[PDB]
Every structure is written in C-alpha cells, then in structure tokens.
C-alpha cells in the first residue's frame, strides 16, 4: 500500500534525525567511556547489578535496523546508559562523573530534538 510506504518514509526520516542526535550525544563522551558494552569478561558480576545494560554501539545497531519508532524509545536507551553507570559506580569515580556530564550536556541536544520531531512530524 501507499500508506505503508509513507509510514516507512517517516521512519526513515526519523532514523536520519536520530543518527544526527546520536552523533552529537556521543561527542559529549570524548573519553569513550560509553562507546561499548561493559565487558562480562572484565566485570563478571555486572548483570547481578544491572538488568538492562546499554551503550552507544548497541544503540547504533538498533538505530541502523530502524528499531526506534519514536524519540521516547531512543531517549529510554540513552537514559539507561547514564542511569546504569550512576548505580554501578560510586560518586567519586571518573565513570560516574562522566555520566553526569553526559546527562547535562545531552539534555540540551535532546531538548531541541524533541522540538524537531514534533515540528516536522
């Protein structure tokens, strides 16, 4: 149907916008602390602590399969990155501090992405 195609073009366009958001958020992590999944070889107890691990590479895989239907889903995954780190790591660590900085810097990016998603439809 033409309607199914139109819906597919919208998903494609949302995918484009989310890729640009993802790039901008990941620039706010120049240490690449959140680039890859926490290694279960190096942190063997991690899944006893954190039930839904998340990282930028895993988001990027989802994004490229057009697996985010809306901005809310993408923000949920970004929030898991931050929130997981802030639970596993103590306040006095470079990890926790990186998460706070990412949260604070990313909020600005996400605020204008929400306006763009709404605006363009």
From Swiss-Prot:
Chain ranges of the Bromo domain: 9-113
UniProt tissue specificity: Highly expressed in testis.
Covalent cross-link Glycyl lysine isopeptide (Lys-Gly) (interchain with G-Cter in SUMO2) as placed by the record, residue numbers: 41
Protein localization: Nucleus; Chromosome
Superkingdom in the source lineage: Eukaryota
Subunit description: Component of some HBO1 complex composed of KAT7/HBO1, MEAF6, ING4 and BRD1/BRPF2. Component of the MOZ/MORF complex composed at least of ING5, KAT6A, KAT6B, MEAF6 and one of BRPF1, BRD1/BRPF2 and BRPF3. Interacts (via PHD-type zinc finger domain) with unmodified histone H3. Interacts (via PWWP domain) with dimethylated and trimethylated 'Lys-79' on histone H3.
Biological role: Scaffold subunit of various histone acetyltransferase (HAT) complexes, such as the MOZ/MORF and HBO1 complexes, that acts as a regulator of hematopoiesis. Plays a key role in HBO1 complex by directing KAT7/HBO1 specificity towards histone H3 'Lys-14' acetylation (H3K14ac), thereby promoting erythroid differentiation.
Protein's recorded name: Bromodomain-containing protein 1
Organism: Homo sapiens (Human)
């Amino acid at each position: 149907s033409m309607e199914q195609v139109a819906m597919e073009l919208r998903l494609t366009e949302l995918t484009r916008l989310l890729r640009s958001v993802l790039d901008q958020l990941q620039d706010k992590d120049p240490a690449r602390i959140f680039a890859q999944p926490v290694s279960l070889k190096e942190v063997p107890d991690y899944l006893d602590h954190i039930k839904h691990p998340m990282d930028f590479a895993t988001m990027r895989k989802r994004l490229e399969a057009q697996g985010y239907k809306n901005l809310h889903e993408f923000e949920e995954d970004f929030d898991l990155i931050i929130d997981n780190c802030m639970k596993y790591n103590a306040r006095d660590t470079v990890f926790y501090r990186a998460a706070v900085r990412l949260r604070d810097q990313g909020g600005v990016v996400l605020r204008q992405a929400r306006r763009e998603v709404d605006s363009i439809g």
